[PDB]
Short mmCIF file of C-alpha atoms in Angstrom, two decimals:
data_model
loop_
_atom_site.label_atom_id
_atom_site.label_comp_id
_atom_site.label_asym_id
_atom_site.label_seq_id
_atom_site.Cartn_x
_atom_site.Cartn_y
_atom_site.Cartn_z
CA UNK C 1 -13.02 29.41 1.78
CA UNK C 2 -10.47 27.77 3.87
CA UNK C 3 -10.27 24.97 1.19
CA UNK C 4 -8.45 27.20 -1.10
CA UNK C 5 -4.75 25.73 -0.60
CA UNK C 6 -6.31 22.03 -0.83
CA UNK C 7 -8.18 23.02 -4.24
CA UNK C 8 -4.83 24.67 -5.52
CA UNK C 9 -2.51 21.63 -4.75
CA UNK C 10 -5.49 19.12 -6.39
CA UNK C 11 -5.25 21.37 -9.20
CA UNK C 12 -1.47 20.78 -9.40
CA UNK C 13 -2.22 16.74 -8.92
CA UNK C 14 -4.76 16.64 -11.28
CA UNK C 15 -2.20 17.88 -14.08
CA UNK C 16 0.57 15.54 -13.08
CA UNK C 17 -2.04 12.58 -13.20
CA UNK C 18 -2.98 13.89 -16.56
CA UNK C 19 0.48 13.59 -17.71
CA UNK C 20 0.74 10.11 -15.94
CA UNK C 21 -2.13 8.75 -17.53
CA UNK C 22 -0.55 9.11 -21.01
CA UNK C 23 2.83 7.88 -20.43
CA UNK C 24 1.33 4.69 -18.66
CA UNK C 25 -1.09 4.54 -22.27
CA UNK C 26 2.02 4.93 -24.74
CA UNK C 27 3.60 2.16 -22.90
CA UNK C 28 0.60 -0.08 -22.24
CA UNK C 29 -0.24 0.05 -25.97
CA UNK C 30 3.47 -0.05 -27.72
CA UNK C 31 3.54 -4.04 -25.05
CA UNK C 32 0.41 -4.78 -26.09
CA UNK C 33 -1.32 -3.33 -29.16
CA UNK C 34 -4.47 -4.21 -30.34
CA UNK C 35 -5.96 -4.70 -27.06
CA UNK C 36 -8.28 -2.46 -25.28
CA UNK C 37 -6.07 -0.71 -22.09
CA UNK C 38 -8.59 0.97 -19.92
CA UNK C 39 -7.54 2.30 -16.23
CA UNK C 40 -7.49 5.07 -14.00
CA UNK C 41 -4.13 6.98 -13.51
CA UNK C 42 -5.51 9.30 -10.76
CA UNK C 43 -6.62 5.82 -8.80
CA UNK C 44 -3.27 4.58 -9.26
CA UNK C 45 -1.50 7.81 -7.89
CA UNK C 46 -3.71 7.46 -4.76
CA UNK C 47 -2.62 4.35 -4.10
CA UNK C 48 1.07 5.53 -4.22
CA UNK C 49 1.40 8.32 -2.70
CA UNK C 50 -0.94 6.78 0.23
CA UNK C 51 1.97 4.33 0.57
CA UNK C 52 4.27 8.00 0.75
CA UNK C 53 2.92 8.17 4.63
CA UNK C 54 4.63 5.15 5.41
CA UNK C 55 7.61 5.08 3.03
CA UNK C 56 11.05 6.85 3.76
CA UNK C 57 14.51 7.21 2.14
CA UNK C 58 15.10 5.86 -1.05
CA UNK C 59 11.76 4.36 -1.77
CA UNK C 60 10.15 7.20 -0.75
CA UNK C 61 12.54 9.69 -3.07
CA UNK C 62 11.94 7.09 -6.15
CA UNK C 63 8.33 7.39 -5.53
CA UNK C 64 7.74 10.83 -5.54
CA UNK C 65 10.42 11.08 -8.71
CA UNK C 66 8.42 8.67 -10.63
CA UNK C 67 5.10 9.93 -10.10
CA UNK C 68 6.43 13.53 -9.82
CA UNK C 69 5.15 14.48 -6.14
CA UNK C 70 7.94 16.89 -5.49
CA UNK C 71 6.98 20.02 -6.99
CA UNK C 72 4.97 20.47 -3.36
CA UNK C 73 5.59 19.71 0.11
CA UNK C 74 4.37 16.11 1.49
CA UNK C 75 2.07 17.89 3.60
CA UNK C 76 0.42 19.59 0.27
CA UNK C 77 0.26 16.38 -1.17
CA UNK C 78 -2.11 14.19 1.01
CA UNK C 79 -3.90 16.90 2.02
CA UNK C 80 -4.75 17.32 -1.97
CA UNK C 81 -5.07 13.74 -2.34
CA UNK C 82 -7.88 14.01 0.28
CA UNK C 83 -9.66 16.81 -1.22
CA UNK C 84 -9.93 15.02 -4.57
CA UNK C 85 -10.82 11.31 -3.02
CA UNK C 86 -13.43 13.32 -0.61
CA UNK C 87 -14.71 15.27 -3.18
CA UNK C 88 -15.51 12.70 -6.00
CA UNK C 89 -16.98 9.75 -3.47
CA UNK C 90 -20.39 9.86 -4.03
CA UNK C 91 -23.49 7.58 -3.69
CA UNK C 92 -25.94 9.86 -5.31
CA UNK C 93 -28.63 9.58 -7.98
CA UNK C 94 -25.93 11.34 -10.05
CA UNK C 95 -23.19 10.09 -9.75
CA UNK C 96 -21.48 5.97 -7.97
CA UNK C 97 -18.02 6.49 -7.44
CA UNK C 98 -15.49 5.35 -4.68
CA UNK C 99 -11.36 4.98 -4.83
CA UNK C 100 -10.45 1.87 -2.51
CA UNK C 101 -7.07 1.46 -1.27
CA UNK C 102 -6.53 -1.81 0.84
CA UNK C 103 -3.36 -3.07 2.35
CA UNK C 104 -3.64 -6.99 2.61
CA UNK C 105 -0.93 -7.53 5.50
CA UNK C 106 0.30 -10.56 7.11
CA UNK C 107 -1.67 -11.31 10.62
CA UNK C 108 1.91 -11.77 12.20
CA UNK C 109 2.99 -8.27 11.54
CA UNK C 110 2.31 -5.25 13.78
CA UNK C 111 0.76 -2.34 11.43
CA UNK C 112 1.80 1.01 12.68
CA UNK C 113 -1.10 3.74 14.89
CA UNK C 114 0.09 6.79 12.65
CA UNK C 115 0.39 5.31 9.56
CA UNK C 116 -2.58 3.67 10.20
CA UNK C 117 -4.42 6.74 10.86
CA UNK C 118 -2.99 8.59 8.41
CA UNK C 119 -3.69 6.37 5.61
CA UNK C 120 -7.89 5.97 6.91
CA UNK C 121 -8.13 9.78 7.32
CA UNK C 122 -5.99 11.42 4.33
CA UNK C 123 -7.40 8.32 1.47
CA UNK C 124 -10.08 6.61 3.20
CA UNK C 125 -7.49 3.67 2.89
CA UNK C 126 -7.90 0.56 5.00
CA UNK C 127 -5.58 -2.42 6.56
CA UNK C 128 -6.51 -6.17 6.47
CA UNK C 129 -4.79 -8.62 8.59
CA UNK C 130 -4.57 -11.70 6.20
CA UNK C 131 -3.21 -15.05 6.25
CA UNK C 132 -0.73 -15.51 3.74
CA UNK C 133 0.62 -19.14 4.94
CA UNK C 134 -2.33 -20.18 2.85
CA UNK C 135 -2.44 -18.50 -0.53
CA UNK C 136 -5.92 -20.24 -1.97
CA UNK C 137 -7.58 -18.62 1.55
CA UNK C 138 -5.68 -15.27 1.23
CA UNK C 139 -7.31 -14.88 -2.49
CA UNK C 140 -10.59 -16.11 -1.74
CA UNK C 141 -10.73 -13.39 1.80
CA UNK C 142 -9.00 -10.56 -0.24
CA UNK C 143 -11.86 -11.16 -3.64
CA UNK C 144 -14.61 -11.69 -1.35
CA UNK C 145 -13.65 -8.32 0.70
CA UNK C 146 -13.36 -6.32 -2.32
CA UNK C 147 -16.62 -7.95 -3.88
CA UNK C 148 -18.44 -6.82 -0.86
CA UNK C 149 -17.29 -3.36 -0.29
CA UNK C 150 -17.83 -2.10 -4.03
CA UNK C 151 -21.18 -4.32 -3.62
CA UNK C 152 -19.95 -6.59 -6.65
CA UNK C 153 -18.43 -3.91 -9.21
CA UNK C 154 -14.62 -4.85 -8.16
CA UNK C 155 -14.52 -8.82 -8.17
CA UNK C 156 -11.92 -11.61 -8.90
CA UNK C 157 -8.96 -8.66 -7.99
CA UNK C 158 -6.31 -11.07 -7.22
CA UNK C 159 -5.70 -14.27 -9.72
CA UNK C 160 -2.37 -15.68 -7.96
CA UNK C 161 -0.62 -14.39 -4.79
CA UNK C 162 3.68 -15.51 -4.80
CA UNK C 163 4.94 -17.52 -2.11
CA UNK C 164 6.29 -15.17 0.61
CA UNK C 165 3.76 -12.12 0.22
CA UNK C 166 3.14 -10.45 3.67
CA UNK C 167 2.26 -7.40 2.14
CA UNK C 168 -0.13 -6.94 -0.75
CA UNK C 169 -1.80 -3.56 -2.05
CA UNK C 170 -5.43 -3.70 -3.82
CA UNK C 171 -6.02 0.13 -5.87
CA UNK C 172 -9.51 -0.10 -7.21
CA UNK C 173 -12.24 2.45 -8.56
CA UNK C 174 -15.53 1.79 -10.10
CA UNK C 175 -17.78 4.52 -11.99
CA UNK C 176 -21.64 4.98 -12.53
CA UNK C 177 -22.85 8.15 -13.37
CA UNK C 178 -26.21 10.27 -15.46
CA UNK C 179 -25.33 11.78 -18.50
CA UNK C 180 -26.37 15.88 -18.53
CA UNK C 181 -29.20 14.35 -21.18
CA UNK C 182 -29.97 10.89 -21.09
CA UNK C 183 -29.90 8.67 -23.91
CA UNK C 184 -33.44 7.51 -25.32
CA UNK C 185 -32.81 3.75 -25.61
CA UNK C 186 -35.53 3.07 -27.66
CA UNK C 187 -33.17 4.44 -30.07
CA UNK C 188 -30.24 2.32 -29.23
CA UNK C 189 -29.54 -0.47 -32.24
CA UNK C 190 -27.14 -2.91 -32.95
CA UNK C 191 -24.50 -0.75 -35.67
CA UNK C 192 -21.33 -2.04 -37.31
CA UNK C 193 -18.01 -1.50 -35.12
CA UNK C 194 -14.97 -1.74 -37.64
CA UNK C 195 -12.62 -3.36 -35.70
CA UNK C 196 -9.77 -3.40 -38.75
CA UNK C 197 -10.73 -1.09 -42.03
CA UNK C 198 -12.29 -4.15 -43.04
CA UNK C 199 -13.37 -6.50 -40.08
CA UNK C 200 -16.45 -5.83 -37.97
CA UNK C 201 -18.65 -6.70 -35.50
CA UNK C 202 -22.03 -5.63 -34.11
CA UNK C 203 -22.33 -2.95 -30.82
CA UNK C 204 -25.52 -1.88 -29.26
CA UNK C 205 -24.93 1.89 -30.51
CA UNK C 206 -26.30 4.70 -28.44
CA UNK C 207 -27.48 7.98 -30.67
CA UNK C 208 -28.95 11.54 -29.77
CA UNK C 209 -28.64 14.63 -31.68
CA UNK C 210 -28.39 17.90 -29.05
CA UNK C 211 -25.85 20.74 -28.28
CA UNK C 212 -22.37 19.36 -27.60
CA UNK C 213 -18.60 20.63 -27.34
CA UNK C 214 -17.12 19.07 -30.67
CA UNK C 215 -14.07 20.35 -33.04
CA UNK C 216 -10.97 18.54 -35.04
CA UNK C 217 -7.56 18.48 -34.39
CA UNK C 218 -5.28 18.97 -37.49
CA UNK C 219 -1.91 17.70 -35.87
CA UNK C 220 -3.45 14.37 -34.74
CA UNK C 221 -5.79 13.68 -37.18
CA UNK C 222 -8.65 13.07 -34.82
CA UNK C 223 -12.29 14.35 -33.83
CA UNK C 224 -12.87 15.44 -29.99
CA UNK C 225 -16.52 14.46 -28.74
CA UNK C 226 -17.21 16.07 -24.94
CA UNK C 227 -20.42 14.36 -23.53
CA UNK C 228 -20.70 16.04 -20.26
CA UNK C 229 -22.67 13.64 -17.07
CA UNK C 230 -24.71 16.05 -14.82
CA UNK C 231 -22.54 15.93 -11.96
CA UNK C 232 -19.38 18.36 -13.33
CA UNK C 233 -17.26 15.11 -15.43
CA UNK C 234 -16.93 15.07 -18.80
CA UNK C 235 -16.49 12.03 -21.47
CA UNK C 236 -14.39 13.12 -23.89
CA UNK C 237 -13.83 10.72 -27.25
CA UNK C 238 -11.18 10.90 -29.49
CA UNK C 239 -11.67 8.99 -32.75
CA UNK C 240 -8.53 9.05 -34.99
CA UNK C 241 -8.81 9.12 -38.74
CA UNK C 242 -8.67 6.13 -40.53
CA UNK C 243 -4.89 4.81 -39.71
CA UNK C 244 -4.09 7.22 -37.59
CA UNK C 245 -4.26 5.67 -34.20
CA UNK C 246 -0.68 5.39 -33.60
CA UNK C 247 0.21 8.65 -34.66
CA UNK C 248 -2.37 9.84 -31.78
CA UNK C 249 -1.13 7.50 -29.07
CA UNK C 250 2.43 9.16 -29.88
CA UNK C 251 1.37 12.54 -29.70
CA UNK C 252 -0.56 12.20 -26.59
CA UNK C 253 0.72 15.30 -23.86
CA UNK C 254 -0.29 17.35 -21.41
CA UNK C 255 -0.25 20.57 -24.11
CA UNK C 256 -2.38 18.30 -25.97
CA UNK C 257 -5.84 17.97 -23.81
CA UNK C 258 -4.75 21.98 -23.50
CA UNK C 259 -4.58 22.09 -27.31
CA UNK C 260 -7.75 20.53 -28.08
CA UNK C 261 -9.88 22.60 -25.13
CA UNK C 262 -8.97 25.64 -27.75
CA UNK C 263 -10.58 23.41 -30.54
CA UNK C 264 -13.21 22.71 -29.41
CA UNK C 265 -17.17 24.69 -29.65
CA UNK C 266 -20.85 24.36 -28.88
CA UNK C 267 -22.27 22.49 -31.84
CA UNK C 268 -25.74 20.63 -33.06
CA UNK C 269 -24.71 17.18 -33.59
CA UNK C 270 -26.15 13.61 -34.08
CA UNK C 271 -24.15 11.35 -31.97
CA UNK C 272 -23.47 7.52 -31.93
CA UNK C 273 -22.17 6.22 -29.34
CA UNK C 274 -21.13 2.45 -28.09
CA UNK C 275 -22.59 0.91 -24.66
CA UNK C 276 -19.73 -0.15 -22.50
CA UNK C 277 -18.90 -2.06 -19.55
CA UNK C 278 -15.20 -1.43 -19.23
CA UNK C 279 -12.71 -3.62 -17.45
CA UNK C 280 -9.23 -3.25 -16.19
CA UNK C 281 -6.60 -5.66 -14.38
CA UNK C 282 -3.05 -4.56 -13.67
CA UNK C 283 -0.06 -6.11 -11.86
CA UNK C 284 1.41 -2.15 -10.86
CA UNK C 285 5.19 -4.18 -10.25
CA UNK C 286 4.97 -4.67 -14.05
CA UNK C 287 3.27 -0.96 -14.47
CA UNK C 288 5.19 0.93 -12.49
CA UNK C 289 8.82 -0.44 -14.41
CA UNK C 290 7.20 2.31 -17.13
CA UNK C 291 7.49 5.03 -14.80
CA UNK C 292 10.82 3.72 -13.16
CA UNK C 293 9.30 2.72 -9.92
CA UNK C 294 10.83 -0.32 -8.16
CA UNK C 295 12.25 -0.21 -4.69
CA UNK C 296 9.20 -0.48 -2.91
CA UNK C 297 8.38 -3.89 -4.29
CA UNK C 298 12.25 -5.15 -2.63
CA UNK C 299 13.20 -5.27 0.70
CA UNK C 300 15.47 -1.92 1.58
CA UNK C 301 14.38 -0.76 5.22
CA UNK C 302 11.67 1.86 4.31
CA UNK C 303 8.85 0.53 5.05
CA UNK C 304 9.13 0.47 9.22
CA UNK C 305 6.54 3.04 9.54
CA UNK C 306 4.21 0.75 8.10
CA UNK C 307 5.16 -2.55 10.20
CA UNK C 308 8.41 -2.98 12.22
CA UNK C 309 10.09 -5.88 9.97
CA UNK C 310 13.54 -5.36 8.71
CA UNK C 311 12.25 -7.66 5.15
CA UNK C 312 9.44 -5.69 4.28
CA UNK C 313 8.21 -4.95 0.83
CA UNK C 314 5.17 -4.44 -0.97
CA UNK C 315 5.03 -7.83 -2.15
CA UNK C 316 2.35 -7.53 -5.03
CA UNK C 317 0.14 -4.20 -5.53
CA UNK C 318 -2.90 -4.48 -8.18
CA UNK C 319 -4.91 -2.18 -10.12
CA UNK C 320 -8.90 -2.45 -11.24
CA UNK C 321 -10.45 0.37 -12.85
CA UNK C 322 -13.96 -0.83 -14.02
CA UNK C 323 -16.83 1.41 -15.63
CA UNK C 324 -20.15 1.36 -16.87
CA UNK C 325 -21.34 3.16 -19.98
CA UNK C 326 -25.44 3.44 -21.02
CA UNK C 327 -28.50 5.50 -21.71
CA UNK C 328 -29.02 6.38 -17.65
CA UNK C 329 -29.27 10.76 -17.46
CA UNK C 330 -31.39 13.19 -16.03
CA UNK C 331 -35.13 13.39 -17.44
CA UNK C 332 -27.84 18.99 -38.10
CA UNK C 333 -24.45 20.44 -39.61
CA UNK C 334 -22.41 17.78 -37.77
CA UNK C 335 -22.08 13.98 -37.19
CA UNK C 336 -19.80 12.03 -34.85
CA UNK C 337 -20.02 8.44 -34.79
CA UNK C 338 -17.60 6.22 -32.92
CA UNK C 339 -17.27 3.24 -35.20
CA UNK C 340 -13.76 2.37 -34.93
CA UNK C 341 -10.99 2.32 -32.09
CA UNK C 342 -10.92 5.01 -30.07
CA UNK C 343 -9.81 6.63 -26.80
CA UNK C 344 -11.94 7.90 -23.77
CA UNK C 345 -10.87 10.00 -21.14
CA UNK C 346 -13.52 10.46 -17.95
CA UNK C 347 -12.46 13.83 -16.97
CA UNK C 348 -13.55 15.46 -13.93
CA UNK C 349 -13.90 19.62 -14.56
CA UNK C 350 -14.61 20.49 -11.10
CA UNK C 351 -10.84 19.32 -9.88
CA UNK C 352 -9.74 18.93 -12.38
CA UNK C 353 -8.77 15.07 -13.35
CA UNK C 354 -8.18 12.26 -15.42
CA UNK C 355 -10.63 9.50 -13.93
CA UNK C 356 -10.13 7.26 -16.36
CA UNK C 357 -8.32 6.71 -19.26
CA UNK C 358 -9.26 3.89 -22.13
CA UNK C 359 -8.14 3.10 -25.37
CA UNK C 360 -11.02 1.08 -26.91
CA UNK C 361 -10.30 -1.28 -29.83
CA UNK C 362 -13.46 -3.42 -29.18
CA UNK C 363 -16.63 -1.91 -26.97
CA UNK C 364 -17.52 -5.72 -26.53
CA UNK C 365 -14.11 -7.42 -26.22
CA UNK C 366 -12.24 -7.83 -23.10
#
């Protein structure tokens, strides 16, 4: 298979996106704790290391240091990146799925052929002349495209553009997908969700009792759940012990998700799940200070590969991860019920990556 070297440096991706994915969760959660954080750190990574083709000298360097795309040559890199992005878009019975990467540009400025190119064939990744003189119009265009492409599962994207924006990056990824064994939602009630050890509030609960991949992790003081979807992803929750959710969050690694794969065996179990229709809006300029990622947000002379203007920056880059969790599949000495906060990971065993990563505090909240 002449896909081999592709698969290998995916592989290699996937593990740095893994990494990525927790980092941007200790962060997100130490800011802002008692929220639900729920994004996708492989989406993300697309969106940065499409901008790779048309970066150079420092801001290129600083990307590929903070996201940690120099173990392999640039070559390797969008030529993995294009594997994974071709391999998980899908529009099948199975499995919804699509990464969008849209560069909102200023109709005055001259977009580059190669980069151009390069960024449609390697991520799929499009440019949209926009006209940023007026900001109200530039919002409305750039929600309105993005509503119609993901066919209303990405909308309201942008909430306020800044004065002087010529250049503005949309990263967005939307998930449906069957469960292995659908969910009989006849069975599906309204259970308590403890919010605090004390405080609750009622979640339409999903529950089935079958064969899945369960076990307990002694160092973190938390139960690992896989549900597997019939296309090859995998939900995996991890429910902390009672007060043990920061402890988790701090202990969260790459040996970790390594850690608990050796934990973990086939099992008869009566599962209770919560429905979900996860949400998630981030301003990367704020994100990316986490990972030490900066310059190409200011004007430094990198970005002529892109468009020939000495000023040019990324003047605002967003992130929308948004998925949707019910009974939809195909056709005891244990217990797991997810009652209380928790953290999914949407993990993708054929590449293999980190889809998405949430830490859910309330399945109802925002």
């Amino acid at each position: 298979v002449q896909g081999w070297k592709q698969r290998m440096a995916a592989k290699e991706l996937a593990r740095q996106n893994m990494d990525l994915g927790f980092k941007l969760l200790k962060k997100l959660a130490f800011y802002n704790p008692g929220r639900n954080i729920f994004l996708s750190p492989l989406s993300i990574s697309t969106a940065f290391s499409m901008l790779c083709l048309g970066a150079q000298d420092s801001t290129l360097d600083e990307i590929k240091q903070g996201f940690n795309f120099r173990k392999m040559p640039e070559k390797d890199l969008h030529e993995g990146f294009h594997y994974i992005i071709h391999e998980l878009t899908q529009k099948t019975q199975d499995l919804k799925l699509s990464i969008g990467n849209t560069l909102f540009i200023d109709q005055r400025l001259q977009p580059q052929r190669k980069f151009l190119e390069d960024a449609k064939n390697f991520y799929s990744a499009e440019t949209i002349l926009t006209n940023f003189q007026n900001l109200e119009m530039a919002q409305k265009q750039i929600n309105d495209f993005i509503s119609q492409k993901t066919h209303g599962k990405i909308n309201n994207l942008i909430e306020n553009i800044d004065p002087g924006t010529v250049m503005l990056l949309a990263n967005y990824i939307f998930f449906r997908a069957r469960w292995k064994h659908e969910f009989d939602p006849n069975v599906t009630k309204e259970e308590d969700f403890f919010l605090e050890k004390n405080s609750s509030v009622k979640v339409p609960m999903m529950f089935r009792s079958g064969i899945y991949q369960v076990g307990y992790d002694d160092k973190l003081s938390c139960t690992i759940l896989e549900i597997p979807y019939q296309k090859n992803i995998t939900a995996i929750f991890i429910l902390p012990d009672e007060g043990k959710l920061k402890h988790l969050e701090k202990g969260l690694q790459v040996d970790t998700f390594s850690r608990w794969k050796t934990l973990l065996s086939r099992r008869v179990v009566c599962v209770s799940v919560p429905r979900l229709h996860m949400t998630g809006t981030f301003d990367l300029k704020k994100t990316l200070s986490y990972i030490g990622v900066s310059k190409i947000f200011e004007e430094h002379g990198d970005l002529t590969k892109i468009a020939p203007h000495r000023s040019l920056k990324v003047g605002e880059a967003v992130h929308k991860a948004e998925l949707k969790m019910d009974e939809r599949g195909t056709e005891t000495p244990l217990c797991v019920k997810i009652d209380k906060p928790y953290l999914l990971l949407i993990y993708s065993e054929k590449i293999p990556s980190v889809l998405f990563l949430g830490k859910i505090v309330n399945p109802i909240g925002k």
